[PDB]
């Protein structure tokens, strides 16, 4: 009776950068309260692949920075050393 939710709005663990920039979201989607949610248009993100996401440590690989548009992390030339 007492275990309801309240709109997709729970926090997500971003990826970090040793160069002192905004924390970026891995992809544009997050599992919030058991649902799949899309980040807002314009949200900073990283655009990684399965092998890339597996090759992520705590910084050693160059992660492609991008911006979330309509649920897709559109890259924008820039790259940053990102870590977990």
């Amino acid at each position: 009776y007492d275990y309801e939710e309240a709109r997709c709005a729970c926090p997500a663990r971003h990826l970090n950068n040793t160069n002192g920039t905004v924390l970026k979201l891995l992809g544009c989607h997050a599992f919030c309260n058991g649902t799949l949610c899309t980040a807002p248009d314009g949200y900073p993100c990283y655009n990684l692949t399965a092998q890339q996401v597996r090759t992520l440590t705590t910084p050693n690989t160059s992660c492609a920075v991008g911006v979330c548009m309509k649920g897709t992390c559109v890259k924008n030339g820039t790259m940053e050393q990102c870590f977990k």
């Binding site: 007492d2 275990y3 309801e4 939710e5 309240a6 709109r7 997709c8 709005a9 729970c10 926090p11 997500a12 663990r13 971003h14 990826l15 970090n16 002192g20 920039t21 905004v22 924390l23 970026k24 979201l25 997050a30 309260n33 949610c37 980040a39 807002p40 949200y43 900073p44």
Partner: protein, 61 residues
Amino acid sequence: VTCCYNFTNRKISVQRLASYRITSSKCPKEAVIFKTIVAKEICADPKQKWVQDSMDHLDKQ
């Protein structure tokens, strides 16, 4: 490394919140994180007046 990409659309009653935390400097959006009695985390914008009042009423306890 925990930030909020979305704020709470509606507004939650102080009687359903257990505590709150602050987010990191390098977060894209600055917000407060409330923990509900059911152990869920909701994001709220500190600009909204009801959010500041709820955080105040939860601190004084």
